[PDB]
Amino acid sequence: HLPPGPRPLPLLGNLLQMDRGGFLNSFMRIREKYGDVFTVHLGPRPVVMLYGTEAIREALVDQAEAFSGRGTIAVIKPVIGDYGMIFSNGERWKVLRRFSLATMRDFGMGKRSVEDRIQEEAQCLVEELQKSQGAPLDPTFLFQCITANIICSIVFGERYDYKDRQFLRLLDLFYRTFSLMSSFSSQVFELFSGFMKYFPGAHRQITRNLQEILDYVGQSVEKHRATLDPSNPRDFIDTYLLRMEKEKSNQHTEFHHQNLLISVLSLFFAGTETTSTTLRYGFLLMLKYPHVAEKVQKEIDQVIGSHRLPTLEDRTKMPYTDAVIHEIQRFSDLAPIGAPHKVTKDTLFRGYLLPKNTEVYPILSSALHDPQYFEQPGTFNPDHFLDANGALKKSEAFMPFSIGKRICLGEGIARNELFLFFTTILQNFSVSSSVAPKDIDLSPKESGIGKVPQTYQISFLARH
Numbered sequence: 474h475l476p477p478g479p480r481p482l483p484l485l486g487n488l489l490q491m492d493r494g495g496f497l498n499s500f501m502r503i504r505e506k507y508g509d510v511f512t513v514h515l516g517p518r519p520v521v522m523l524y525g526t527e528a529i530r531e532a533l534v535d536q537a538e539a540f541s542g543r544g545t546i547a548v549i550k551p552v553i554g555d556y557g558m559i560f561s562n563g564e565r566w567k568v569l570r571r572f573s574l575a576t577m578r579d580f581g582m583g584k585r586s587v588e589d590r591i592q593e594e595a596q597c598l599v600e601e602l603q604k605s606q607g608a609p610l611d612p613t614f615l616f617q618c619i620t621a622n623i624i625c626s627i628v629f630g631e632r633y634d635y636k637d638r639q640f641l642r643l644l645d646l647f648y649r650t651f652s653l654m655s656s657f658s659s660q661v662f663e664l665f666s667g668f669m670k671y672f673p674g675a676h677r678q679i680t681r682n683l684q685e686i687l688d689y690v691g692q693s694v695e696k697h698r699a700t701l702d703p704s705n706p707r708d709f710i711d712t713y714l715l716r717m718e719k720e721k722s723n724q725h726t727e728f729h730h731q732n733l734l735i736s737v738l739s740l741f742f743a744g745t746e747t748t749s750t751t752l753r754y755g756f757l758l759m760l761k762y763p764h765v766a767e768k769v770q771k772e773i774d775q776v777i778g779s780h781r782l783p784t785l786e787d788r789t790k791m792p793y794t795d796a797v798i799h800e801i802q803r804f805s806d807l808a809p810i811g812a813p814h815k816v817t818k819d820t821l822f823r824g825y826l827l828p829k830n831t832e833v834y835p836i837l838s839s840a841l842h843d844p845q846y847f848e849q850p851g852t853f854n855p856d857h858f859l860d861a862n863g864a865l866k867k868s869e870a871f872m873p874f875s876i877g878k879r880i881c882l883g884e885g886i887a888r889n890e891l892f893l894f895f896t897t898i899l900q901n902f903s904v905s906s907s908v909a910p911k912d913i914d915l916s917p918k919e920s921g922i923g924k925v926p927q928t929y930q931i932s933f934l935a936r937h
């Protein structure tokens with residue numbers, strides 16, 4: 474009945490078939506033995522893994538509803554639980570995703586206003602790197618600044634200065650937490666939290682970090698109440714507050730205080746740590762393959778020039794840069810073991826019966842590195858997204874934002890951020906570092922529920 478897999482042991486589950494290389498390396502080895510759809514017991518819990526573009530789509534697209542449930546990540550479950558639009562299920566999920574989409578669009582998502590804020594934020598970024606004057610720097614903080622300011626403007630109603638001390642702290646917390654979430658420790662914790670939770674570990678520092686961020690969120694929510702004008706909501710929080718007051722009538726409403734706190738935390742995270750991390754890998758990749766960079770700048774020069782601000786319309790006439798960004802996303806592989814799903818009802822899949830609430834991991838990494846769709850999946854090559862004519866070549870295998878009903882809410886804003894921030898930085902600068910291109914290390918610094926590049930230093934030099 475469940476998909477096949479290695480026989481589990483009492484207590485240990487399938488620990489014996491696990492690998493110290495982490496979940497992804499482990500699952501890859503079990504797949505060779507049991508095929509594309511198989512079962513691994515994480516501690517006592519059966520989890521169905523789905524490998525390859527075809528298996529992943531057959532589930533998340535062809536039985537979209539059955540595979541639309543949300544599973545759990547043990548290490549963020551203490552603080553986050555199943556509140557907000559991301560880790561919720563059923564009517565709460567349906568209500569909060571719809572609410573969040575509608576609301577983000579009211580404050581600009583997919584419209585000229587957010588396009589302008591990204592342009593404005595890029596211009597702030599260029600001015601800051603000119604002040605550095607060649608000098609090598611670690612771009613982690615700035616890449617976080619520029620992406621967080623876009624979501625902050627939609628959620629908190631403001632952007633923050635690059636030297637704001639409380640902004641620095643929050644971004645430090647986000648970076649450290651995403652890495653901690655991605656560490657070998659969190660994976661071991663996913664197996665054995667019932668036992669490990671009593672002891673020191675990554676899981677504890679993650680609860681503390683998330684709680685410190687949640688304090689800031691609480692502060693911001695209170696201050697939103699004080700200045701709340703019911704006929705001009707400035708942002709996501711106000712809009713939520715207004716709906717909250719209106720629905721105090723219903724006792725089973727989803728719009729309560731906890732869903733607000735966690736809704737904001739969810740959006741704040743992931744708007745600080747996703748596009749930001751992708752970008753950071755992008756320029757490490759630009760350091761390793763400078764010929765790719767030059768070919769991007771040459772296309773910038775032809776389509777845009779060296780002075781006007783890039784626009785989203787410019788991307789449609791820039792297939793090569795677009796392909797490069799696709800390839801940066803395919804390679805950097807932000808969410809490898811995907812994100813935990815589960816089936817909402819008893820489900821028949823490839824002759825298997827998955828009982829209701831069975832966890833399901835769509836191994837997105839196996840789609841992004843699918844050999845039937847990409848000639849050399851382990852290598853960074855823009856040609857994976859170019860056809861013979863040099864036009865942008867789409868791929869069903871390209872699912873860095875996943876697919877189906879749970880598909881990333883921020884896909885649009887993330888694609889637009891990546892294009893505008895990437896294309897604007899290379900318009901004004903070229904990049905270099907002490908480290909020889911052949912010595913550039915592309916192995917992840919942490920690989921787990923997220924993928925994080927190695928730390929590096931980089932120089933932004935004006936190009937005459």
Ligand code: HEM
Pocket residue numbers: 558559560570624740743744747748751807808811812813873874875876878879880881882883884886887
């Ligand atoms: C490169 C940037 C991003 C990537 C690669 C990305 C990727 C993903 C992935 C893989 C998921 C899980 C989908 C699944 O469960 O199957 C997800 C979910 C989600 N993302 Fe993103 N995301 C990115 C940026 C953002 C941004 C900027 C936002 C909002 C500002 C955002 C909001 C969300 C939300 C709300 C969900 C949960 C969707 C749901 O459960 O309905 N993400 N994202």
Ligand SMILES: OC[C@H]1O[C@@](CO)(O[C@H]2O[C@H](CO)[C@@H](O)[C@H](O)[C@H]2O)[C@@H](O)[C@@H]1O
Pocket residue numbers: 867868869870871872874875876880884
């Ligand atoms: O990047 C391709 C990948 O993204 C998705 C969902 O984000 O694109 C959706 O919109 C596409 C644009 O045409 C459609 O082709 C695609 O069918 C649609 O689902 C995935 O679907 C697609 O694999």
Ligand SMILES: Clc1ccc(-c2cnc[nH]2)cc1
Pocket residue numbers: 549559738739740742743747881
């Ligand atoms: Cl706690 C948390 C919240 C959101 C994400 C996310 C959404 N889309 C991409 N990453 C990751 C982790």
Ligand SMILES: Clc1ccc(-c2cnc[nH]2)cc1
Pocket residue numbers: 559560747807808809811812813922923924
């Ligand atoms: Cl529900 C969920 C969980 C994790 C992520 C993620 C992994 N890596 C980055 N973001 C996204 C969505």
